[PDB]
């Protein structure tokens, strides 16, 4: 019944005292934190508190949609000596600091990823040319499926691969995805290995990187330029914005203190110093 948009317990009035009751004194060893209300260390009046935590709720903290990655792709002239560029990004929030620190406050999470795409595009070369409104294909290639070889190959036939055909210049594309986790919460922090080493085997044959779980959890995104090699080479960028909608979090871990380094919690030297200076006796 106590929803997020209620109204903090109104401040009760309170006069002098001289009781053997000792609210003020704690003892942090117990790990428990004294739930002392303002009403204890001072005489308080009867304030009718209207303010509510309706905005700090776990749902609202992650109410904005963060940018998980950018993806460069380009359609060059047929006569191009180089193969046509089709970017392929492996679904995993861990690419940019922002959304990665928010999620990282919690040990485990169960959310419904609601991916949106703001696709842009300019003419590379100095050459003064034209290009009929391009259309892009954003194929979701599920963990284990065959990742696209050439730009135009069979893999793109997409008989069973959830794909979106975005026409340039239009309301930015959006596809909601339900908890696609193998477990019961995406583990923001995995302690342990994906293969245990066994004595009756070579040090290699059975090794593995710490913290890594599934080879392809979330999946991979194949994005091509669907049209054919056009005289005027046009490069494009597909910025994907992931916004965790129906979300839940567990175990409140302390926020990242020093600059992120790689997919693993590991940290580079130098960046190791986070705090700022201040005299132990200056306001």
């Amino acid at each position: 019944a106590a929803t997020s948009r209620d109204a903090l317990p109104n401040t009760e009035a309170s006069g002098p005292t001289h009781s053997k009751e000792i609210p003020a004194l704690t003892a942090v060893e117990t790990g428990a934190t004294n739930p002392l209300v303002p009403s204890d260390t001072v005489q308080t009046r009867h304030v009718v508190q209207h303010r509510s935590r309706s905005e700090s709720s776990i749902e609202s903290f992650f109410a904005r949609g963060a940018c998980v990655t950018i993806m460069t792709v380009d359609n060059p002239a047929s006569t191009t000596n180089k193969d046509k560029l089709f970017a392929v990004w492996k679904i995993t929030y861990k690419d940019t600091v922002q959304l990665r620190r928010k999620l990282e406050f919690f040990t485990y999470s169960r959310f419904d990823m609601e991916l949106t795409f703001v696709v842009t595009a300019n003419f590379t070369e100095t050459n003064n040319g034209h290009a009929l409104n391009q259309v892009y294909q954003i194929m979701y290639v599920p963990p284990g499926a065959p990742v696209p070889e050439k730009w135009d190959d069979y893999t793109w036939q997409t008989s069973s691969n959830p794909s979106i055909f975005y026409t340039y210049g239009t309301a930015p594309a959006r596809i909601s995805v339900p908890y696609v986790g193998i477990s019961n919460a995406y583990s923001h922090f995995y302690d342990g290995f994906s293969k245990v080493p066994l004595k009756d085997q070579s040090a290699a044959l059975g090794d593995s990187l710490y913290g890594a779980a599934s080879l392809n959890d979330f999946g991979i995104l194949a994005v091509r330029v669907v049209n054919d090699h056009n005289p005027t080479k046009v490069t494009s960028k597909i910025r994907v914005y992931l916004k965790p909608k129906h979300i839940r979090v567990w175990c409140p871990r302390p926020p990242r203190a020093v600059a992120y380094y790689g997919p693993g919690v590991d940290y580079k030297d130098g960046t190791l110093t986070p705090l700022s200076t201040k005299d132990l006796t200056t306001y």
């Binding site: 942090v28 303002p38 260390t41 903290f61 904005r64 600091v97 949106t116 200076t277 201040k278």
Partner: protein, 235 residues
């Protein structure tokens, strides 16, 4: 069919917008949730858990253990502050990183009473009385027990019950204060002084240290979410 009219604001994407959108994997049998020990329903819950304040931030002692140990001595009673602190559970470098102060940067307005808890970490024999004090803004910060004394203080005692907590009652001119070092929405001033002196018997460590913790009270709340300055993504 049905004559409609596209309204100013159509084809417009708004990051924090909330509209229903086609599902990429139709029918996908979602895996049933288990009952994992330790859920969290609202950020301000975390705000009510004490986190040790790194009181000392001297070039030498910063970014290293020594930063949380506020040393006290058996020096002859003086009337000078054995720590200060600008109530800005967001701005002041001393609080800017504590869970509370770390969550406070992801917001533009904080409110409600805070509760500083101090733990005497030293020899069971050592005794003494420390005066933890707060004085709302707009007046010379307190630099002498004589001046700080006048404000809101809890003359604490180093005994069996090893810790204290001086609630800083939400006394402010606005309903919420800027979570940035703004002058109009000033915080106030916190400062612990010796009400006596830490007296010790012979063959005792003459230099014990105190650790301070800070947390919000079931009154505190924040609003208007933003991006914390705390972590940068270089290139």
């Amino acid at each position: 069919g049905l004559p409609v009219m596209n309204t100013p604001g159509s084809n417009q994407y708004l990051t924090a917008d909330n509209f229903q959108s086609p599902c990429a994997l139709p029918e996908f049998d979602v895996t049933p949730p288990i009952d994992i020990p330790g859920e969290v329903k609202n950020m301000m819950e975390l705000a009510e858990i004490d986190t040790m304040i790194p009181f000392d931030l001297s070039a030498t002692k910063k970014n290293t253990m020594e930063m949380y140990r506020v040393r006290l001595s058996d020096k002859p009673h003086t009337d000078d502050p054995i720590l200060c602190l600008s109530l800005s559970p967001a701005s002041d470098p001393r609080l800017s990183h504590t869970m509370l102060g770390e969550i406070l940067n992801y917001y533009t307005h904080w409110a409600g009473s805070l509760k500083f808890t101090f733990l005497f970490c030293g020899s069971m024999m050592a005794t003494g009385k420390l005066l933890v004090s707060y004085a709302p803004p707009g007046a010379d910060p307190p630099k002498k027990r004589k001046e700080a004394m006048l404000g809101t203080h809890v003359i604490w005692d180093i005994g069996l019950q090893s810790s204290c907590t001086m609630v800083v009652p939400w006394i402010s001119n606005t309903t919420y204060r800027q979570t940035i070092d703004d002058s109009f929405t000033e915080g106030g001033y916190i400062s612990v002084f010796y009400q006596t002196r830490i007296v010790v018997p012979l063959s005792t460590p003459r230099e014990m240290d105190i650790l301070g913790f800070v947390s919000a009270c079931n009154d505190f709340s924040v609003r208007l979410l933003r991006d914390t300055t705390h972590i940068e993504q270089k290139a």
